[PDB]
Coordinates of N, CA and C in Angstrom, one line a residue:
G1 N -2.2 12.1 16.5 CA -1.4 11.7 15.6 C -1.4 10.9 14.4
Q2 N -1.8 11.4 13.3 CA -1.8 10.4 11.8 C -1.1 10.6 11.0
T3 N -1.3 9.6 10.0 CA -0.3 9.1 9.4 C -1.0 9.8 7.8
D4 N -0.3 9.9 7.0 CA -0.3 10.8 5.5 C -1.5 9.6 4.9
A5 N -1.4 8.3 5.2 CA -2.2 6.8 4.7 C -3.9 7.4 5.4
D6 N -3.3 7.7 6.5 CA -5.1 7.9 7.2 C -5.5 8.9 6.7
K7 N -4.8 10.2 6.5 CA -5.9 11.3 5.3 C -6.7 10.8 3.8
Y8 N -5.4 10.6 2.9 CA -5.1 10.5 1.6 C -6.0 9.6 1.2
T9 N -7.3 9.2 0.4 CA -7.5 7.4 -0.1 C -6.9 7.4 -2.0
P10 N -6.4 7.3 -2.3 CA -5.8 7.2 -3.6 C -7.0 6.5 -4.5
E11 N -6.7 6.1 -5.7 CA -8.1 5.9 -6.8 C -7.1 4.8 -7.4
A12 N -7.8 3.9 -7.9 CA -7.1 3.0 -8.7 C -7.6 3.3 -10.4
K13 N -6.8 3.6 -11.0 CA -6.8 3.6 -12.5 C -6.5 2.9 -13.0
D14 N -7.0 1.8 -14.3 CA -7.0 0.5 -15.0 C -6.7 1.4 -16.3
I15 N -5.8 0.8 -16.7 CA -4.7 0.9 -17.9 C -4.9 0.2 -18.8
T16 N -4.2 0.6 -20.2 CA -4.1 -0.1 -21.3 C -2.5 0.2 -22.1
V17 N -2.1 -1.2 -23.1 CA -1.0 -0.7 -23.2 C -0.5 -1.8 -24.4
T18 N 0.5 -1.1 -25.5 CA 0.8 -2.7 -25.8 C 1.5 -3.8 -25.0
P19 N 2.0 -5.2 -25.3 CA 3.0 -5.7 -25.2 C 4.1 -4.4 -24.9
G20 N 5.1 -4.5 -23.6 CA 6.2 -4.1 -23.3 C 6.7 -4.4 -22.2
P21 N 7.8 -3.7 -21.5 CA 8.2 -3.6 -20.2 C 7.1 -3.1 -19.8
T22 N 7.4 -3.1 -18.7 CA 6.5 -2.8 -17.3 C 6.0 -1.7 -17.4
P23 N 4.4 -1.5 -17.1 CA 4.5 0.1 -17.5 C 4.7 1.2 -16.5
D24 N 4.8 2.4 -16.3 CA 4.4 3.7 -15.0 C 3.9 3.5 -14.4
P25 N 4.2 3.0 -13.1 CA 2.9 2.9 -11.9 C 1.7 4.0 -11.5
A26 N 3.0 5.6 -11.9 CA 1.8 6.4 -11.8 C 0.6 6.2 -12.6
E27 N 0.5 5.5 -13.8 CA -0.7 5.6 -14.3 C -1.7 4.8 -13.7
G28 N -1.4 3.8 -13.0 CA -1.9 3.3 -12.1 C -3.4 4.0 -11.1
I29 N -2.8 5.7 -10.9 CA -3.6 6.1 -10.0 C -4.6 7.0 -10.8
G30 N -5.4 7.2 -10.2 CA -6.8 8.4 -10.9 C -6.6 9.3 -10.5
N31 N -6.1 9.8 -9.0 CA -6.6 11.1 -8.6 C -5.6 12.3 -8.2
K32 N -4.4 12.0 -8.7 CA -2.7 11.7 -8.2 C -2.6 13.6 -7.4
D33 N -4.0 13.9 -8.3 CA -3.7 15.9 -8.1 C -4.9 16.1 -6.5
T34 N -4.8 14.8 -6.2 CA -5.6 14.6 -5.0 C -4.7 14.4 -3.5
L35 N -3.6 14.5 -3.9 CA -2.6 13.7 -3.3 C -1.2 14.4 -3.0
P36 N -0.5 14.5 -1.5 CA 0.9 15.7 -1.8 C 1.5 15.7 -2.6
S37 N 2.2 16.5 -2.3 CA 3.2 16.5 -3.8 C 4.4 15.8 -3.1
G38 N 4.8 15.1 -3.8 CA 6.2 14.8 -3.1 C 5.9 12.9 -2.5
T39 N 4.4 12.3 -2.9 CA 4.1 11.5 -3.0 C 4.9 10.1 -4.3
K40 N 4.9 9.4 -3.8 CA 5.6 8.1 -5.1 C 5.0 7.3 -5.2
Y41 N 5.3 6.5 -6.7 CA 4.4 5.1 -7.2 C 5.1 4.5 -7.8
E42 N 5.0 2.7 -7.4 CA 6.1 1.8 -7.5 C 5.2 0.6 -7.8
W43 N 6.0 -0.6 -8.9 CA 4.8 -1.1 -8.2 C 5.5 -2.6 -7.3
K44 N 4.2 -2.9 -6.5 CA 4.5 -3.8 -5.5 C 5.5 -5.4 -5.7
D45 N 4.8 -5.6 -7.2 CA 5.2 -6.1 -8.0 C 5.8 -6.0 -9.5
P46 N 6.0 -6.0 -10.0 CA 6.8 -6.0 -12.0 C 5.4 -6.6 -12.5
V47 N 4.5 -5.7 -13.6 CA 3.4 -6.8 -13.7 C 4.3 -6.7 -15.4
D48 N 3.3 -8.1 -14.9 CA 4.2 -8.8 -16.6 C 3.6 -8.8 -17.9
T49 N 4.2 -7.5 -18.5 CA 2.6 -7.0 -19.7 C 3.3 -7.6 -20.9
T50 N 4.7 -8.4 -20.8 CA 5.0 -8.8 -22.2 C 4.3 -9.7 -22.9
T51 N 3.2 -10.1 -22.7 CA 2.3 -10.8 -23.5 C 0.5 -10.4 -23.1
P52 N -0.4 -10.3 -24.1 CA -1.6 -9.5 -24.2 C -2.6 -10.7 -22.9
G53 N -3.2 -10.0 -22.9 CA -4.0 -10.1 -22.2 C -4.6 -9.3 -20.1
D54 N -5.3 -9.2 -19.6 CA -5.7 -8.3 -18.6 C -4.7 -9.1 -17.3
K55 N -3.9 -8.2 -16.7 CA -3.2 -8.2 -15.4 C -3.7 -7.5 -14.8
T56 N -3.1 -7.9 -13.3 CA -3.6 -7.5 -11.8 C -2.3 -7.4 -11.4
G57 N -2.4 -6.2 -10.9 CA -1.1 -5.7 -10.3 C -1.4 -4.7 -8.9
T58 N -0.1 -4.3 -8.4 CA -0.6 -3.7 -7.4 C -0.2 -2.1 -7.5
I59 N 0.0 -0.9 -7.3 CA 0.8 0.0 -6.9 C 0.9 0.2 -5.5
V60 N 2.3 0.8 -5.0 CA 2.7 1.2 -4.3 C 2.3 2.6 -4.1
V61 N 1.4 3.2 -3.1 CA 1.6 4.6 -3.1 C 2.2 5.0 -2.2
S62 N 3.5 5.5 -1.9 CA 4.4 6.2 -0.7 C 4.4 7.9 0.3
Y63 N 4.0 7.8 0.7 CA 3.5 9.8 1.2 C 4.9 9.7 1.6
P64 N 4.6 11.8 1.9 CA 6.0 12.1 2.3 C 6.7 11.9 3.1
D65 N 5.4 10.9 4.2 CA 6.1 10.4 5.6 C 6.4 9.4 6.0
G66 N 6.3 7.8 4.7 CA 6.5 7.4 4.3 C 5.6 6.2 4.8
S67 N 4.7 6.2 5.4 CA 3.1 5.4 5.2 C 2.9 5.3 3.9
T68 N 2.4 4.2 3.3 CA 2.1 3.7 2.2 C 0.2 2.9 2.2
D69 N 0.5 3.3 0.7 CA -1.1 1.8 0.6 C -0.5 1.1 -0.7
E70 N -1.6 0.3 -0.9 CA -1.3 -0.2 -1.4 C -3.1 -1.0 -2.2
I71 N -2.8 0.0 -3.6 CA -4.3 -0.1 -4.5 C -3.5 -0.7 -5.4
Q72 N -5.6 -1.8 -6.2 CA -5.0 -3.0 -7.1 C -5.3 -2.3 -8.4
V73 N -4.8 -2.6 -9.3 CA -5.2 -2.6 -10.9 C -5.1 -3.3 -11.5
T74 N -6.7 -2.5 -12.7 CA -5.9 -4.3 -14.1 C -5.4 -3.5 -15.6
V75 N -4.8 -4.2 -15.9 CA -3.6 -3.6 -17.1 C -3.8 -4.3 -18.2
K76 N -4.9 -3.6 -18.6 CA -5.1 -4.2 -20.4 C -4.0 -4.7 -21.1
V77 N -3.0 -5.0 -21.5 CA -1.9 -5.5 -22.7 C -2.9 -6.3 -23.7
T78 N -3.0 -4.9 -25.1 CA -3.5 -5.5 -26.1 C -3.1 -6.8 -26.9
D79 N -3.6 -7.4 -27.8 CA -3.4 -8.1 -28.9 C -2.5 -7.4 -29.8

């Protein structure tokens, strides 16, 4: 009786951006090719990338069955 979250292991990928609005969360998973098609990506909470610095955020990976993983990443906002 397994869920998708029992089977798949998303990998964090740190990203770098210029100051700007919250980036595309798909950029924070480094092994999307390993995950089922129909897997969705969203930030748990929007990362504030409006100012420079190293931000911490979490990507919610939602599998086709509705189970989830939560993956923390660093977003390096440049000066």
